[PDB]
Amino acid sequence: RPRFSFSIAAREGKARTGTIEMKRGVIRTPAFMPVGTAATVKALKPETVRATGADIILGNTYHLMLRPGAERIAKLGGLHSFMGWDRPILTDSGGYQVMSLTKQSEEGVTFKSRHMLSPERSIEIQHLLGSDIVMAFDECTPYPATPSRAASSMERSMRWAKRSRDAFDSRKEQAENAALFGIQQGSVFENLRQQSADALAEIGFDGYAVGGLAVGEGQDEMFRVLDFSVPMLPDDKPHYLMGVGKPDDIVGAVERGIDMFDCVLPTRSGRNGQAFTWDGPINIRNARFSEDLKPLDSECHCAVCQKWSRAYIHHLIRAGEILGAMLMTEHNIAFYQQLMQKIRDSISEGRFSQFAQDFRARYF
């Protein structure tokens, strides 16, 4: 396989469906990436993650650099071997996590256990982890943001994008086996998003992420920003909306040109008792499910819905049992992957717009 090849097989409006071929495997798009913060998709074996339909997962530079350590993982053979996932892995740059979970300067960021992070070290950490899709080191502008602060932050991110590109290219093994994605910033302002998109295109990346969203702005605002922001990015490269994952959010983003997604909602809310269904999410802890023998979702074909009832999972979660977390999480990620499959197929068949309408009608 090639280091990286994104091919668009079908389109409908701004939506696209296709594939990204990489050395470790093929990624079907639009794609959803389960999040695996500490070298594990919480409560799931890698084979279960794959069984749900996931083609790629997301790892984090921040968490892993702290524990168990980037150099250590490299010494142990890389993240893939370490956690037992042999397919593509996209790693965030750590910038966003640092300013969420510090001394900021043009050189990078320092945090407390004093650790430092810069464009060059971020890229090196992702190399040590053995990441397939490396994210440029950026600064996720807080929401809301004044145009001045948004501009300053975006400008710094573009300078860091250039530094990330060069760091990545100076490492032969990494440049030949991995891919590099740039990240668009600019808050909710069209002129800044345009400047950011242009700066990124000038540098040149294998993919372009839309950053700075999913940080407090409602869906209406997010969609408004995507409306003018995605068209600014190179059409022949993947478009990655970072941190976005809610079912309806994903459908709307795909309708606007997004090809990739990631978010902790499926996993985290799963462990909290929230199960996704085509008729909307349900809180399995609610008393009304104590004797409900139906599966989490009536149409879902995941292993959990084929074997256990809402009543049983209700019991497990209220009892604080680990199996509860395991079952809720497997179903949720499977639901997400099923959503992506439906999106891909509808686009391929030229009926995505109708699928989106039907989805919203029943989900809400």
Ligand X SMILES: Cc1cccc2c(=O)nc(N)[nH]c12
Cβ atoms of residues 147 and 192 within 8 Å: yes
CB of 5 to a second copy, least distance (A): 30
Can you spell out the DSSP letters for 101-144? --EEETTEEEE---EEE-HHHHHHHHHHHT-SEEEPP-----SS
Q: Is 240 annotated as a binding residue?
A: no
- Taking CB under 6 A as the criterion, the residue among 211, 238, 257, 270 binding ligand X is 211
Taking the least distance from each CB to a second copy, the nearer of 189 and 312 is 312
How is residue 172 written in tokens? Answer: 């032969």
Q: State the binding partner of 331 from Zn ion, ligand X, a second copy, none, CB within 5 to 8 A by kind.
A: Zn ion
* Piece of the chain touching Zn ion by CB under 5 A; list 162-170, 178-186, 291-299, 340-348: 291-299
Total of residues contacting ligand X (CB under 6 A): 13
**Closest distance of CB 75 from ligand X, Å:** 26
- Give the C-alpha separation, 137 to 186, whole Å: 15
Give which of 203, 251, 262 is closest to 226, Cα–Cα: 251
Tokens 């439906």 -> residue: 342
C-beta of 360: minimal distance to ligand X in Å?
24
- Short-list 168, 195, 194, CA closest to 181: 168
User: Which one, 135 or 284, has the nearer CB to ligand X?
Assistant: 135
The one-letter amino acid code at 233 reads: L
- 212 is annotated as contributing to ligand binding: yes
> What does the alpha-carbon distance between residue 82 and residue 85 come to, in Å, rounded to a whole number?
8
Contact 23, 1 (CB under 8 A): yes
Taking alpha carbons only, the member of 237, 187, 185, 229 closest to residue 208 is 237
Active site annotation includes 220: no
Per partner kind, with CB cut-offs from 5 to 8 A, the member of a second copy, Zn ion, ligand X, none near residue 183 is ligand X
Binding residues for Zn ion (CB under 5 A): 296, 300, 302, 304-305, 331
Binding residues for a second copy (CB under 8 A): 38-40, 42-45, 67-68, 72, 75-77, 82-84, 290-291, 293, 307-309, 311-312, 315-316, 318-319, 321-323, 325-326
